[PDB]
Symmetry: C2
Subunit: 159 residues, 2 copies
Amino acid sequence: MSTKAIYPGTFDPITNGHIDIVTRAASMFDKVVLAIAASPSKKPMFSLDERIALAEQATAHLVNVEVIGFSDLMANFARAQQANILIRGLRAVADFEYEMQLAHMNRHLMPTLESVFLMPCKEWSFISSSLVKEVARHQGDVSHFLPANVHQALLNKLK
Amino acid sequence: MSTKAIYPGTFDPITNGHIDIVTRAASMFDKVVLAIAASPSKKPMFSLDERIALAEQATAHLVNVEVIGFSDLMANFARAQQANILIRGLRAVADFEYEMQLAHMNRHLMPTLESVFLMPCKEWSFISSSLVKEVARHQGDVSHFLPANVHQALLNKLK
């Protein structure tokens, strides 16, 4: 009943793994905002506008998904968006501790916000989006891991 | 716009941690079945009928939650119940690998079934049916961890 979720991340760039997560989120909640962090601590390969553009194209086929940049705490953005659900992808064990921490902090910041964890398809279990960049930087075939539009934009960035 | 989840487990017995998980599940999905495994491999302290009774009482305040026994694979029961969502409590990093395995198997058995992972409230982050029972078996105060009705039943089982 009127479920609204945010799916925050850097999405530098968005990968088939992300698409899978947001697709499955969009299948179980009424609305999903794919929230792109504006000022990440790490210098991203793509600008906020570029990242939004690529994500938009890659998720245009999802009716109930909307891309939006944000610069605040993901907890504050969720409050502004009147989201009661926070989507987090769970790839590996190492990340689990951090994700527990973040959920407990987010509970502290906004107790009505519910963190929800999804695992990726086996296909995308071992892709990193930093391993994808790194492989691409040193001239490898990453076509299987990215949406066509994203792959093109990445090829251009390495010239 | 329609969501039906199962939350499978042995629930021998149901704890505050379980109640917390199913409560949060019930807040974000239209219907939630608290599915109690009939014949766990291990011999449970309480019978299926007892485990149903205690869980019923302890979830009677949740309108859209229904307790049901099952004896098949959780993936088949989900198919029977027309569940598209499977709730898993994800407390320990140790259990994460197993949970990843299970979701991959459950995706094999029923591809339309979406595994969803929730982390407990900090308060219940360290409790298990097993450690509660063990403490209680050697005469310790477990009142904080169990619904009153469950606590009473457990005291009687050990006296």
